[PDB]
UniProtKB/TrEMBL annotation, chain B:
[4Fe-4S] cluster 2 binds at C22, C51, C54, C57. This is Photosystem P840 reaction center iron-sulfur protein. It comes from the Bacteria. [4Fe-4S] cluster 1 binds at C12, C15, C18, C44, C63. Residues 3-32, 42-74 form the 4Fe-4S ferredoxin-type domain. Signal peptide: none annotated. The chain holds residues 129 to 223 of 231 of the full protein.
Length: 358, 95, 94, 362, 358
């Protein structure tokens, strides 16, 4: 049987704005594919405009989890800006703590995104492009203070491994993507190149030695990768005129999974040409990645998508059909919507499109 | 404002449904006869000096001849506020 | 095709000419915009060959007088290159 | 109670010919109420494949193919037309031309190709101990010379960009595989069992032609398989140049939508039935690449199954060892429905490659 | 419908011992994903202590199968010892026969297992580690007598291929993993490196020429690979004080699958800290590998798990719950246990853990 109870809400804003509120609840009675149970997690994402002249924004992220009687925490906090429309700059710092061990770090990064082609026919014959092949290049300089015995041990072991073996650059990818993540890398459509180390140094600092490393890598995609094909959509620096948030939490166990999500941010709705707007095309990486854990138990589906529009907006060409119009709201439940939900909770990437106008 | 509406002359049939929605303070829509009104001789029109871009004339989805267009602010021309996705078809027989 | 695909008013896909800018060539800027208005196309002899057969119709929107080769009667006989005569619609508000 | 219904209605027919002939007619209908895994919907397509014997002395045959599709309010067309011949039993030669048109853009091309297929071993014990080999590892090598006339501005732009990319970067040869297999296709490449090697460019030239410059490119690549790849393991079966004494056709069409999928297939061609030794013949072993490739989209909705398979034999032929069992014998026809046949159909519509074998004699 | 009838039993031993008896029955009415049917197989695995001073043990293995009217047999018999805790030595011989063809061989092998890191924080903050990345290196010297015409043909063809082509070292991996096995290699989490040939020789022997080959290869894992992450668990040379056995057999057909397994060996239960013991963590490679054939037909599930403990042992924190306690036995059936069984018969790796004490 294994019913799957889920509850969704989108709330939009009028005019030329693109902001939106998102709310989500979920429940299943199926065992998660985690070789360590139970597992709990909360995520806070916040972002505020540092200053619009430079385009600089400040973004924070906090993770706590309890994984089989073990507390894990990861804090990161950074400043990001688009230096060009295909280069991005970031300066940030954070820390990671597991059990009793903990250490901080400060990074200094740049990212460059390149597409394999720029043909304008692809721009005048296809109104809604989806797949777009390209490659990203990351250049990272990170400094970590060495104060613990274990930090010094890791540092010396890494220096010895980098010095001695000639296949460090490609074997590091084995340690990098631990467990099933590596497998997804092939299927999710990505390709990680061999890293290239530009030098590991150690310098005296405030309290003691600090290990400085700078390295470069690249990863390409066939179009399914959102971070490449949709480089412009995922960092809306224009509409961040007020702080935005994303705030989620799951709590897994030996008998089903619990989900809870809030969010409010721009980029929810985009122009679709001819005066009509649309909900943004659903990202594909989460769908195909979750499809690797969603095929283990056949399940029953019930859900309710509830979309609230501003004054004077109408939904036209909603595929599949909605069920009710409470004069501003549209509700989807059962039938073809339920079939589509069951389809996408197993890795399917079929399109459920909503167009609205005024 | 932007996005004018521009009733097409040659396609209009004079049903007048476009004229109903325009607010009474704005008599932007009118009639033209020039002949006998049984073979299509009373086609209507839109006055551009009074229209205030309500979209009541286009968003209502009432024109049956596709005579209202609602040209976009930059250069684009519409004909109806949404069009089906133009598939193509055959016949089947389950054997 | 079937009446239920595309728009039911028209017997085939309709296009309009929207731009007539002169760029070192006179009339490079023929911008064939469809009825739904999601693209901005051009003469593009493939478009011309699908025009001449049965499937494309174009119109001129009285809102490139000679550069589109008006010929000589009824104030309108617009032809594109040699073959097919793009009919035009009128919108005279006066 | 239980889970989703989603019935899947399908209808199949095979019609054979007697004697030593191998020709056959194939007919297929299909329907599902499940959303296709296409991030652009709706999507429609028709396919025409025709082939006629150019001349038997050389072994040359002429083959045509036409594709039309409407993908989310966008018309796409691809025409190809070529002449193929087996120069040896492990080399093949082809000369052809075609065009591709999307929306308003369109361009033609003419290619000049050769293909060489090699197996990794030739041990004859594998030939005397195994009566029906299935997996056979090998590698294919493609050598292509294609010319495309440059007449559009966009064609010239693509050409110049490609020349600049090939000149500048040193990793073009292996990064081209990212652009090559767009989207999920790339992923299938790993699982479907294939391995594409890095291409090797032998020179990009441009020469004046009838109406203007023409870009000429010639390149080589190779791809190997562990045995699951039909184009390698069954190199001899997929191009039956002997029995093409009359024109043959394959003619299909699918029409997808946000609520299920429609299928329609006709065909008539040789190679449907093969000798099985000891006087018995058999339907050819089912290809594996289509099964495993379709298995990547067939696991998204649990479904109910109903189908016919209806096989018509010539005079005096009998089916013996049909596994699973058939249901009826209308004195020349054999019908499969429900039960183990339905289970096998549900099995193969999800990527399974279990064997359903039919042997007939006279 | 496709009911799946399965029957399981574990029997443990008391004290500090780790020995155990395992019994298993299984039945399905689904067509196996074998492009040749029917297919039958029996497996015998025996091991006895050669001598404890050296640590040397002797292990035998016999395989018979009938694959679509074709008899196949493989015999191997070898002596293995742990020379260090990360090196292993083996000397053995065997033969393989298909239909009428048959030939023997004698091998001489060493294996080295290396982990990518040794951080002790990972050892003091995580009580039950699961994923552990590393790499294995195999060095093999095998001799095969050339007496048949076909053996000489294979030998000459291989010498010609190794001499002529420059891409033999990496293209050999195509012939190596025949068919779907290759695909699993990516997904199962493994990476096989290019082999390196150290020389192919031929020398006169008792009855004639013998082909001698020695070669090296390596394979790394992201942690999912048991042969790497659990290098210490899979060869319990301590508790083999009496002969142990594993004895299985499957028998497939065009309409379902039959399974039958006996076994008795140490390593079934391990210490879990704080006086409690546990059943060993379930291996992951078999689960994910069988998940590639277990998604083809939706099926109904019924099973027993019946665990028998020694005197004075109690199960505490069994997740999911058991059903009955016949004063020494614990039985799992239906409900969450059935859901977990259906989960793991499709590739899921959720944890079903049993802790017992006294
Ligand atoms: C995931 C796919 C690609 C990836 C894609 C990107 C993209 C895209 C970007 C970076 C950028 C960065 N990446 Mg990277 N990057 C990857 C793997 C890595 C790895 C690694 C060990 O694997 C490292 C060290 C880095 C390092 C970095 C830094 C150089 C840089 C800034 C990080 C940041 O701000 O932190 C902050 C960390 C987070 C906020 C964690 C939350 C991340 C998730 C994905 C955010 C989800 C957004 C959520 C859906 C909506 C949020 C809205 C809220 C209102 C804010 N990347 C993988 C391979 N990387 C950024 C950059 O350009 O810097 C110049 C950037 O835009
Ligand atoms: C971008 C990744 C974060 C990071 C995130 C984590 C996480 C997450 C964990 C640790 C953990 C630990 N960290 Mg740390 N760690 C980083 C930077 C460092 C540096 C350094 C000189 O920069 C050092 C010495 C360490 C040291 C240590 C290990 C000794 C310790 C436990 C072993 C472990 O798995 O490590 C993991 C090692 C790393 C992820 C990279 C170490 C970098 C090496 C030493 C220097 C760079 C080499 C190479 C050029 C970079 C390759 C790219 C990376 C492979 C992605 N970290 C960077 C800032 N670190 C563990 C812990 O906190 O408690 C057990 C753990 O779970
Ligand atoms: C930076 C990320 C990983 C790391 C990534 C790698 C990679 C990748 C490799 C090694 C390699 C090695 N590493 Mg290291 N290694 C790290 C931390 C460590 C630590 C430690 C106490 O933290 C230790 C003892 C080692 C020890 C070693 C040896 C097992 C081996 C090479 C030793 C040598 O050549 O002589 N590494 C960090 C945590 N290490 C090489 C090896 O042989 O692995 C089998 C190798 O390819
Ligand atoms: C698909 C698996 C392999 C593949 C396997 C083969 C095989 C096998 C052959 C070729 C051959 C050719 N391939 Mg190749 N080839 C592949 C990828 C490519 C790519 C590319 C960009 O990816 C290119 C450019 C080429 C190029 C070419 C030309 C060099 C050559 C002739 C093509 C042809 O006649 O067109 C015509 C195009 C078609 C007819 C389209 C229809 C194709 C489908 C597969 C046909 C299905 C047959 C249907 C089931 C039954 C038809 C029966 C009807 C009665 C006719 N191949 C992939 C990697 N290639 C042929 C050759 O040898 O030339 C010397 C040949 O025999
Ligand atoms: C075997 C593949 C067919 C082909 C099939 C298509 C298809 C399908 C499409 C295009 C499309 C286009 N074609 Mg073309 N195209 C071919 C040959 C060419 C050549 C040339 C010099 O030979 C050029 C300049 C072009 C130019 C163009 C692009 C400018 C344009 C839109 C971008 C796109 O995605 O391109 C795709 C580019 C190619 C598939 C290969 C271009 C070849 C390059 C320029 C020269 C060979 C370089 C290298 C040695 C060969 C690598 C192998 C290929 C990667 C498989 N084509 C060959 C004959 N072409 C698009 C269109 O028609 O409307 C948008 C589109 O959808
Ligand atoms: C032949 C098939 C693809 C193609 C395949 C590749 C591949 C593969 C690569 C490039 C690369 C590049 N290509 Mg190219 N490229 C094509 C068509 C184009 C077009 C165009 C208008 O049609 C443009 C502008 C480009 C432009 C570029 C730059 C983004 C980049 C290298 C520029 C340089 O070194 O300086 N390509 C054709 C359509 N191109 C290189 C790159 O950096 O990609 C990120 C690269 O590796
Ligand atoms: C499977 C994952 C890894 C693998 C992991 C290991 C591991 C781990 C070991 C070896 C070891 C060996 N491997 Mg290796 N090895 C692999 C692939 C290969 C290949 C090949 C062509 O692919 C070859 C030729 C070899 C060759 C060899 C010899 C060098 C050596 C001894 C074999 C043995 O004793 O035979 C005997 C053959 C068997 C007994 C067949 C049964 C095998 C299965 C897996 C046993 C299941 C155990 C069962 C669950 C419980 C048994 C308990 C009973 C009481 C006994 N390996 C794959 C890539 N290999 C051993 C060694 O170290 O030698 C020094 C060793 O410990
Ligand atoms: C570890 C693998 C076992 C082995 C297991 C099998 C199996 C299983 C089969 C055969 C079969 C055959 N064996 Mg043997 N075979 C081995 C060693 C040899 C040697 C040799 C000089 O060592 C030779 C000449 C042969 C010869 C033959 C082929 C002529 C014959 C049928 C073709 C086949 O597929 O072969 C398969 C070839 C091999 C598996 C490897 C052959 C080794 C080559 C010639 C020398 C080593 C080259 C290279 C350095 C090693 C690469 C590693 C391997 C690819 C894994 N074998 C080793 C001992 N052999 C078939 C049979 O018995 O009846 C049809 C069959 O099904
Ligand atoms: C050792 C395991 C396999 C083996 C693995 C390979 C691999 C791997 C390759 C070859 C390659 C070749 N092998 Mg060999 N090859 C074997 C047994 C044979 C036998 C035989 C009667 O047993 C034959 C005829 C061949 C013949 C050949 C040719 C098809 C080809 C190179 C010929 C050359 O360069 O000139 N191999 C054994 C059974 N062989 C090369 C090739 O071209 O493959 C297409 C290649 O890459
Ligand atoms: S847009 Fe408004 S003002 Fe203009 S014609 Fe229509 S209803 Fe009248
Ligand atoms: S609704 Fe259309 S047809 Fe009727 S009067 Fe208005 S413009 Fe003319």
């Amino acid at each position: 049987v294994t019913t799957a109870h889920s509850d969704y809400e989108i709330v939009l804003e009028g005019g030329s704005s693109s902001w939106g509120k998102v709310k989500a609840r979920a429940k299943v009675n199926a065992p998660p594919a985690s070789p360590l149970l139970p597992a709990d997690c909360d995520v806070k994402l916040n972002v505020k405009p540092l200053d619009p002249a430079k385009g600089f924004v400040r973004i924070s992220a906090v993770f706590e989890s309890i994984v089989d009687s073990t507390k894990n925490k990861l804090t990161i906090e950074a400043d990001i800006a688009n230096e060009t429309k295909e280069r991005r700059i970031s300066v940030g710092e954070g820390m990671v703590s597991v059990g009793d061990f903990s250490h901080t770090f400060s990074f200094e990064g740049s990212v460059v995104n390149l597409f394999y082609y720029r043909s304008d026919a692809v721009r005048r014959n296809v109104p809604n492009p989806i797949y777009m092949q390209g490659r990203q290049f990351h250049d990272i300089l990170m400094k970590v203070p060495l104060d613990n015995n274990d930090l010094i041990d890791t540092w010396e072991g890494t220096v010895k491994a980098i010095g001695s073996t000639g296949a460090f650059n490609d074997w590091i990818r084995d340690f990098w993507f631990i467990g099933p993540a590596f497998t997804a890398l092939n299927e999710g459509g990505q390709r990680i190149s061999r890293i290239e180390v530009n030098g590991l140094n150690t310098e005296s600092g405030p309290k003691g030695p600090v290990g400085v490393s700078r390295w470069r890598f690249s990863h390409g995609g066939s179009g399914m990768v959102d971070s490449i094909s949709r480089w412009a959509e995922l960092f809306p620096s224009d509409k961040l005129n007020r702080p935005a948030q994303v705030e989620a939490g799951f709590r897994s166990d030996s008998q089903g999974i619990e989900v809870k999500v809030d969010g409010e941010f721009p980029g929810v709705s985009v122009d679709a040409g001819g005066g009509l707007r649309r909900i943004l095309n659903h990202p594909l990486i989460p769908l195909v990645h979750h499809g690797m854990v969603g095929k283990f138990n056949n399940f029953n589906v019930d859900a309710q998508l509830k979309v609230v529009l501003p004054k004077g907006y109408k939904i036209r060409y909603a595929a599949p059909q909605y069920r009710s119009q409470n004069l501003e709201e549209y509700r989807w439940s059962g039938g073809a919507y339920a079939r589509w939900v069951e389809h996408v909770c197993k890795g399917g990437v079929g399109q459920f499109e909503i167009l609205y106008a005024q | 404002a932007k996005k004018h509406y521009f009733i097409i002359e040659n396609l209009c049939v004079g049903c007048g449904l476009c004229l109903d929605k325009c607010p009474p303070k704005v008599n932007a829509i009118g009639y033209k006869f020039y002949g006998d009104v049984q073979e299509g001789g009373f086609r209507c029109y839109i006055d551009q000096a009074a229209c205030i871009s309500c979209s009541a004339c286009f968003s209502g989805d009432e024109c049956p001849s596709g005579a209202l267009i609602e040209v976009l602010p930059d250069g684009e021309v519409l004909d109806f506020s949404y069009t089906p996705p133009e598939r193509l078809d055959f016949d089947l027989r389950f054997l | 095709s079937g009446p239920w695909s595309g728009n039911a008013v028209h017997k085939a896909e309709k296009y309009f000419i929207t731009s007539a800018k002169r760029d070192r060539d006179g009339k490079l800027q023929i911008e064939l915009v469809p009825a739904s208005g999601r693209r901005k196309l051009s003469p593009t002899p493939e478009m011309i060959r699908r025009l001449i057969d049965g499937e494309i119709e174009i119109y001129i929107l009285t809102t490139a007088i000679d550069m589109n080769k008006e010929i000589i009667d009824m104030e309108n006989r617009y032809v594109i290159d040699f073959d097919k005569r793009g009919v035009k619609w009128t919108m005279r508000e006066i």
